[PDB]
Amino acid sequence: AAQTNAPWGLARISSTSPGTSTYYYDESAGQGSCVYVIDTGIEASHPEFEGRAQMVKTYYYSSRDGNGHGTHCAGTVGSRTYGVAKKTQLFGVKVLDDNGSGQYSTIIAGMDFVASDKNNRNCPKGVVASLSLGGGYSSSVNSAAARLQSSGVMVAVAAGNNNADARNYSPASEPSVCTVGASDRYDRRSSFSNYGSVLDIFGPGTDILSTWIGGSTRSISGTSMATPHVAGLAAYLMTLGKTTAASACRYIADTANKGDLSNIPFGTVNLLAYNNYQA
């Protein structure tokens, strides 16, 4: 399938070169997979989600996304226009308040929630969780992400936006999950992207158009935007049967575009997420 005039990041993930604008992908499109977006919520009524999004859990007075961040990330995973995996099921877990903040204890509870809640959902092609969040190093936060991954969920986490080594941030620094840095449309490391040996992969993160609250759209930047590209890619590849939740991060790294990014510090992987779809 071909989506013309796609957001640059979608075109990038199906291309061997920057500078194109059509996204190419297998029409299976993540059907039968599920992606949890652990964030500020999801405006599931947005026409872009086509009834495929729902809130399953909140720790606050509402499950609604009063911020926009979670809706934007969910849009990059799975919206009809802005999403990588256009037929996946999206499940929102609101661990962040409407200012975008959340206690680590709530975030941990949300990860353990997903590890159990997947047993209440129909996801025959597999389960992914996208975590566009983080703070300073915490062994307990890393352990929660490790448990979620161990339970059979492909966990993708943001590297962070500090232009620093991600070893000092959580859950970015957890070895067993997929830690995602950000790139721009010219294949440069995004100016804010964290780096370091703990990164597994880069995805599009600068000037990413996606869904927003109030039935709208906007373009924002962050490793928060790169992470759902990778989460959606994992769901898409799992639906194709090419990989599993336990092996998808390694598979994405195996099949990435290699050596094409600029300003990657010595010792950080130079790998850009790529669907290897041959139309």
Side-chain angles (χ1 to χ4, degrees), residues 1-26 28-86 88-257 259-279:
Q3 174 190 352
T4 48
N5 301 109
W8 79 262
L10 300 190
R12 191 69 194 84
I13 72 157
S14 61
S15 186
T16 55
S17 290
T20 70
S21 60
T22 307
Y23 176 38
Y24 307 109
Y25 63 93
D26 188 277
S28 60
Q31 173 78 39
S33 71
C34 302
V35 186
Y36 286 83
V37 180
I38 304 175
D39 210 288
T40 63
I42 308 175
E43 182 173 283
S45 66
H46 199 302
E48 276 283 316
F49 295 123
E50 314 178 295
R52 291 179 289 102
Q54 44 261 306
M55 291 301 303
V56 298
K57 179 65 174 179
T58 182
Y59 298 88
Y60 306 91
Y61 50 82
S62 174
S63 65
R64 292 178 220 100
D65 182 10
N67 182 277
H69 182 269
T71 292
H72 194 276
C73 294
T76 298
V77 177
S79 67
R80 66 192 183 183
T81 304
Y82 311 98
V84 172
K86 298 176 188 299
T88 196
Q89 291 285 323
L90 298 163
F91 299 138
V93 179
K94 181 172 173 62
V95 300
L96 303 181
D97 66 26
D98 286 343
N99 296 326
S101 301
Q103 300 291 288
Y104 268 166
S105 54
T106 302
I107 293 159
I108 289 168
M111 294 191 241
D112 288 318
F113 172 87
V114 174
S116 179
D117 183 73
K118 71 182 190 283
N119 298 312
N120 286 326
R121 312 294 165 191
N122 287 297
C123 311
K125 299 298 187 188
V127 183
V128 181
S130 194
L131 283 69
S132 290
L133 55 76
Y137 179 85
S138 160
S139 61
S140 299
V141 170
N142 282 9
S143 183
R147 287 192 299 277
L148 180 55
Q149 176 71 50
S150 167
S151 81
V153 177
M154 188 291 174
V155 179
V157 311
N161 309 318
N162 316 93
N163 187 35
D165 198 307
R167 72 197 302 168
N168 280 321
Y169 300 91
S170 288
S173 60
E174 167 52 38
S176 70
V177 301
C178 209
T179 301
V180 183
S183 63
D184 77 13
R185 72 173 72 244
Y186 300 114
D187 284 351
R188 305 178 294 210
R189 179 169 71 86
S190 305
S191 61
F192 49 80
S193 186
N194 284 351
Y195 50 83
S197 65
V198 71
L199 268 69
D200 296 285
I201 192 68
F202 283 80
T206 298
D207 297 334
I208 306 303
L209 182 57
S210 191
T211 41
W212 200 253
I213 53 169
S216 62
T217 60
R218 69 177 58 183
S219 175
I220 56 171
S221 300
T223 62
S224 286
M225 291 52 266
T227 302
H229 280 92
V230 172
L233 178 60
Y236 165 89
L237 294 169
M238 288 149 65
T239 287
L240 280 174
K242 302 198 159 258
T243 190
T244 70
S247 52
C249 188
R250 186 177 307 210
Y251 179 86
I252 287 166
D254 282 352
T255 60
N257 281 309
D260 295 320
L261 299 175
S262 63
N263 202 35
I264 301 289
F266 199 80
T268 296
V269 295
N270 193 328
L271 298 172
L272 179 64
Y274 174 50
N275 73 359
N276 199 22
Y277 177 67
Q278 300 320 320

